[PDB]
Amino acid sequence: REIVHIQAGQCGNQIGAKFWEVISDEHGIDPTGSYHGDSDLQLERINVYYNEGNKYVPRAILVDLEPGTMDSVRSGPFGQIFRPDNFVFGQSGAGNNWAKGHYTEGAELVDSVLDVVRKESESCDCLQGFQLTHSLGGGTGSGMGTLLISKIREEYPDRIMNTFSVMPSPKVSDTVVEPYNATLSVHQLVENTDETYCIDNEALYDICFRTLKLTTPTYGDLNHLVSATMSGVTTCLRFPGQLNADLRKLAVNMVPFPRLHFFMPGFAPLTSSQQYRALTVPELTQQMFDSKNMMAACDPRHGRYLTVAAIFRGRMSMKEVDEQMLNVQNKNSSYFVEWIPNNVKTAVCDIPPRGLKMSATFIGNSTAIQELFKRISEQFTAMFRRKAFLHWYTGEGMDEMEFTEAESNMNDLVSEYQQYQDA
Amino acid sequence: MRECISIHVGQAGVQIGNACWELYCLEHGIQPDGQMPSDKTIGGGDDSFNTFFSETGAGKHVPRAVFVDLEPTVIDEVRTGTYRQLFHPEQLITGKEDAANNYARGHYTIGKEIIDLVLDRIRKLADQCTGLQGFLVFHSFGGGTGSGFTSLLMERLSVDYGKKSKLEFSIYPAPQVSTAVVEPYNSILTTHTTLEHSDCAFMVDNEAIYDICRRNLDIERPTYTNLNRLISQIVSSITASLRFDGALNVDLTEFQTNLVPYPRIHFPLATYAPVISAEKAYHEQLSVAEITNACFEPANQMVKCDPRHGKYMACCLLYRGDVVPKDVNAAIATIKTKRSIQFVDWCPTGFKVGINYQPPTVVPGGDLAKVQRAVCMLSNTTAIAEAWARLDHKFDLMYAKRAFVHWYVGEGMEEGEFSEAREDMAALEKDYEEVGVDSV
Amino acid sequence: EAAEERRKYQEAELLKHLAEKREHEREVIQKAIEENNNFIKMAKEKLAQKM
Ligand SMILES: COc1cc([C@@H]2c3cc4c(cc3[C@H](Sc3nnc[nH]3)[C@@H]3COC(=O)[C@H]23)OCO4)cc(OC)c1OC
Ligand SMILES: COc1cc([C@@H]2c3cc4c(cc3[C@H](Sc3nnc[nH]3)[C@@H]3COC(=O)[C@H]23)OCO4)cc(OC)c1OC
Ligand SMILES: Nc1nc2c(ncn2[C@@H]2O[C@H](COP(=O)(O)OP(=O)(O)OP(=O)(O)O)[C@@H](O)[C@H]2O)c(=O)[nH]1
Ligand SMILES: Nc1nc2c(ncn2[C@@H]2O[C@H](COP(=O)(O)OP(=O)(O)O)[C@@H](O)[C@H]2O)c(=O)[nH]1
Ligand SMILES: [Ca+2]
Ligand SMILES: [Mg+2]
Ligand SMILES: [Mg+2]
Ligand code: NA
Ligand code: NA
Known part of the structure; x- marks a missing residue:
């Protein structure tokens, strides 16, 4: 059950390349693709993310409308490891413009990408689906990425589409048009993904500044958090054990209504590393569920958990994990819905990430995520009521009507999440 | 890839062009014969400075530039000047009869005789580009050629290059520096005609630059050479992101997204610091906070107006030299508690920051002091x-x-x-x- | 077979929706082309008329 990974745009390829550095290490794959690890859990499900002279190649497609960031990946630590024909890029760039990524610049390049997708999918014994990394605030990841998702769905309508989508924030902003690009993209995701991990740059910044006490956070700091999250959230897909998860079971079990498939991840311990005191299982469980540990700037106490999946990594007391997990629900039963029984599930994996003797990762489908879409909707509306900056988009062929419909669809989404916060 | 072609029109545009290209060469280590010893790829390359310089197989680095004037005597000084060898003779275009301070002659009577030649030379430059990004057009509002021929050229560039971007550096007239009586006519005519054809225009008020030279450099009556050296430093700040790269570098096109909320509202206000004499710079190091603060002082604007009496729709800070984001963020935190910075209610209030690490240079024997860090603020203010x-x-x-x-x-x-x-x-x-x- | 046919009906609706997306994509880019060309033509004609 192979996954095809696609990373698109600047953010997409930066957090993408970090994801491959991190899990390649966890599976014992060195920058040159040769396996030099010491355990066999490492190779048992390696084919979920790697193709196979007994070298392993990420099943990864690297996409961007300008060659810069992908020159950086090819020069980076693990750059040698990607299949050279899987780099697919243009020269023009997307100017932080959804319309250029989705309708003009990106349209020119998307068929080349689908040829590489198709070739990877053919060498698949049984394709699970796709995992895309991208931001929603730019032009290539946002506009071209959602165009890819649509073209992929049309060619593989019975496969799962999974995204790690970085949501923009004024606290870590490149351009004023980010709310426009993000609102246009959310609309695409509501319709064409089965699971979207909301990685909120506002939450990552807050975590870097308050908890990690980094007063001048870089994208490198933010990406350290995203890397740790992507590893933990994919653990049960890549490692054998008790529960061997996959993308379709993820969606069946976490998504009670097809549009509410936007998840808040959480991670513990949060680190910038520098500490050798390993945490007790009680502490992992306490921090992981603390708001200060979630990668979407939403207050879970403002909403309710529909479904939760937790994974603990390292060597530790299974009996103590179950006890603490059951403790958190039985102590805050108000924040779990009554009409989905037994909606919190817990897994364990013996293999900890790097630099940590034990960790915990949390996948949550919480109605509090509506706060993130409200925030974006407010920022969108502040400009759109004056039609500010719209000429960047109408110059590419778009009409205002399309913005109005995207605003409407996202407000509907917020409404639907509130409907089940009061059920 | 990402080439920019510069076009210098009339006396103002040409003389500012002299200053700018001299400064670029010093910043990039290009000698007056065009040789660049640091450049190990002979005859080509995709380096950041190749956006502004092409390369011959003989190692010469040639400005992607055309100089045009309807009289010969200002361009003749380029043809015979220090940097004569930089340019191919075909890049320097002159007529015989200028526009006599008259928009009508620059746009019609005289300009129509040379526009086809000018466009043919520009086409020759464009054909050498693998990914032309757009044009930078340098010109006065007030001269007959700077107003009238520039509008003709801009109209024709829109026809020949579609919506390819065109940026202007426009010299706004001030009585102090010489000026025909009809310059208000020429200014309105060219502003009206070029408005739909320009994507972004940096106005430079000759009175602002004159005042900055008198006040900061202690020059009693600044010359054109004084004004143009200061102007080239602002131009260099604005184009530095095109010509250098670095981790904290932010491309001018990204600032432009923020600076132009409606097509016609495309006139950013530039402010630059620090401008200081050698005598005063000696034993005084201006910090990040110090120079940042200087951007919000109206005396350092390129255009005379009062932003306290308008509203902001964008604020961009372009830093060069020894500057780290930590010091920037602190300086901005301080500024935002001590200054009248009121934004329109439909736009976010963040400042967009870029940092170019290559430090600023100055022309040896000039009046500007060499400093370790400088900043150009670009804001869009209704003022x-x-x-x-x-x-x-x-x-x-x-x-x-x-x-x-x-x-x-x-x-x-x-x-x-x-x-x-x-x-x-x-x-x-x-x-x-x-x-x-x-x-x- | 009736459940199989229901799956087939739903896939066909889906591909028909995506087909409508592709034609909208086509309309957007041909709209941009049409407006750039009309800008160029307008500018060319005004210039000719004023000269
Ligand atoms: C992608 O990683 C995970 C996925 C799930 C997930 C998953 C997610 C859920 C859930 C159930 C379940 C089920 S669990 C099961 N065990 N036997 C049959 N099904 C299934 C199994 O395979 C799955 O993929 C499902 O309830 C709410 O959220 C769970 C996880 O840990 C508990 C994993 O890490 C957090
Ligand atoms: C040939 O004699 C002169 C003519 C002018 C005269 C000239 C005469 C004027 C006038 C303006 C201007 C303009 S000034 C200008 N500077 N930049 C662009 N245009 C121009 C320039 O060249 C000119 O010849 C014009 O306003 C009132 O009277 C001016 C003179 O001295 C001031 C000369 O005095 C003998
Ligand atoms: N800053 C600056 N302003 C200049 C310079 N040269 C001329 N000006 C200003 O430009 C305006 C006059 O236009 P010019 O560029 O000299 O005229 P032109 O484009 O050559 O037009 P014609 O001579 O009439 O054909 C006046 O405001 C002058 O003060 C210069 O070198 N630097
Ligand atoms: N977390 C994170 N966010 C990023 C990174 N790079 C860019 N962003 C964000 O992504 C958005 C800009 O999109 P970007 O990927 O650069 O544009 P694109 O190349 O056109 O897809 C903004 O919201 C940025 O804050 C990164 O490396 N990490
Ligand atoms: Ca002193
Ligand atoms: Mg970017
Ligand atoms: Mg002249
Ligand atoms: Na193109
Ligand atoms: Na070279």
Whole structure:
């Protein structure tokens, strides 16, 4: 059950390349693709993310409308490891413009990408689906990425589409048009993904500044958090054990209504590393569920958990994990819905990430995520009521009507999440 | 890839072009013969400085530039000057008869004789580009060639290059530095005609630059050379992101996304610091906080106006030299508690920051001190319409009597073009009012 | 077979929706082309008329 990974745009390829550095290490794959690890859990499900002279190649497609960031990946630590024909890029760039990524610049390049997708999918014994990394605030990841998702769905309508989508924030902003690009993209995701991990740059910044006490956070700091999250959230897909998860079971079990498939991840311990005191299982469980540990700037106490999946990594007391997990629900039963029984599930994996003797990762489908879409909707509306900056988009062929419909669809989404916060 | 072609029109544009290309060469280590010893790829390459310089197989680094004037004597000084060997003779284009301070002659009578040649030379430069990004057009508002020929050229560039981006550096007239009486007419005519053809225009008020030279450099009567060296430092700050790269570098096109909220509202206000004499720079190091603070002081604006009396729709800080984001963020935190920085209610209030690490240079033997860090702020403020109001008022004074209008009618123009241009300016001024009004 | 046919009906609706997306994509880019060309043509004609 192979996954095809696609990373698109600047953010997409930066957090993408970090994801491959991190899990390649966890599976014992060195920058040159040769396996030099010491355990066999490492190779048992390696084919979920790697193709196979007994070298392993990420099943990864690297996409961007300008060659810069992908020159950086090819020069980076693990750059040698990607299949050279899987780099697919243009020269023009997307100017932080959804319309250029989705309708003009990106349209020119998307068929080349689908040829590489198709070739990877053919060498698949049984394709699970796709995992895309991208931001929603730019032009290539946002506009071209959602165009890819649509073209992929049309060619593989019975496969799962999974995204790690970085949501923009004024606290870590490149351009004023980010709310426009993000609102246009959310609309695409509501319709064409089965699971979207909301990685909120506002939450990552807050975590870097308050908890990690980094007063001048870089994208490198933010990406350290995203890397740790992507590893933990994919653990049960890549490692054998008790529960061997996959993308379709993820969606069946976490998504009670097809549009509410936007998840808040959480991670513990949060680190910038520098500490050798390993945490007790009680502490992992306490921090992981603390708001200060979630990668979407939403207050879970403002909403309710529909479904939760937790994974603990390292060597530790299974009996103590179950006890603490059951403790958190039985102590805050108000924040779990009554009409989905037994909606919190817990897994364990013996293999900890790097630099940590034990960790915990949390996948949550919480109605509090509506706060993130409200925030974006407010920022969108502040400009759109004056039609500010719209000429960047109408110059590419778009009409205002399309913005109005995207605003409407996202407000509907917020409404639907509130409907089940009061059920 | 990402080449920019510069076009220098009339005396102002050409002389500022002299200053800019001299400064670029010093910043990049290019000698007056065009050799660049640090550049190990002979005859080509994709380095950041190749956006502005092409390369010959003989190792010469050639400005992607055309110099055009309808009289020869200013370009002749380029042809015979220190950097004569930089340019191919075909990049320097001259007529024999200038436009006599008359937009009509620059746009029509004289300009129409040379426009096809100018466009053919520009096409020759464009053909050497693998990914042309756009044009940078340098010119005065007030001269006959700077106003009238530039508008003709811009109209033709839109036809020949579609919506390919065109940026202007436009010299706004000030009585202090010499100036024809009809310069308000030429200014309104060219502003009206170029408005739809330009994507972004950096106005430079000769009085602002004159004042900065007198006040900061202690020069009693600044020359054109004084003014143009200061102007080239601002131009260099603005183009530095195109010509250098670095981890904290932010491309001018990304700033432009923030700076232009509506097509016509495309006139950013530039402020630069620090401008200081050698005597004062010696034993004084201006910190990040110090120079940042200087951007918010009106005395350091490129255009005379009062931003305290308008609203912001964007604020961009372009740093060069020894500057780390930690010091920037602190300086901005301080500024935001001590200054009148009011944004329109429909736009975010963050400052967009870029840092170019290559430190600033100065022309040896000039008046500007060499500093370790500098900053150019680009803001979009409704206050810049004060500059249009001032020019529209001088226009109206003369136009109500039709003074000098016969010199334009004699060249084939109609009064209809005057009132249509003036009405366009009136609508521009009303545009700046409307965008500053709070949302319902 | 009736459940199989229901799956087939739903896939066909889906591909028909995506087909409508592709034609909208086509309309957007041909709209941009049309407006750039009309800008160029307008500018060319005004210039010719004024000269
Ligand atoms: C992608 O990683 C995970 C996925 C799930 C997930 C998953 C997610 C859920 C859930 C159930 C379940 C089920 S669990 C099961 N065990 N036997 C049959 N099904 C299934 C199984 O395979 C799955 O993929 C499902 O309830 C709410 O959220 C769970 C996880 O840990 C508990 C994993 O890490 C957090
Ligand atoms: C040939 O004699 C002169 C003419 C002018 C005269 C000239 C005469 C004027 C006038 C302006 C201007 C303009 S000034 C200008 N500077 N930049 C662009 N245009 C121009 C320039 O060249 C000119 O020849 C014009 O206003 C009132 O009277 C001026 C003179 O000295 C000031 C000379 O005095 C002998
Ligand atoms: N800053 C600056 N302003 C200049 C310079 N040269 C001329 N000006 C200004 O430009 C305006 C006059 O236009 P010019 O560029 O000299 O005229 P031109 O484009 O050559 O037009 P014609 O001679 O009439 O054909 C006046 O405001 C002058 O003060 C210069 O080198 N630097
Ligand atoms: N977390 C994170 N966010 C990023 C990174 N790079 C860019 N962003 C964000 O992504 C958005 C800009 O999109 P970007 O990927 O650069 O544009 P694109 O190349 O056109 O897809 C903004 O919201 C940025 O804050 C990164 O490396 N990490
Ligand atoms: Ca001193
Ligand atoms: Mg970017
Ligand atoms: Mg002249
Ligand atoms: Na193209
Ligand atoms: Na070279």
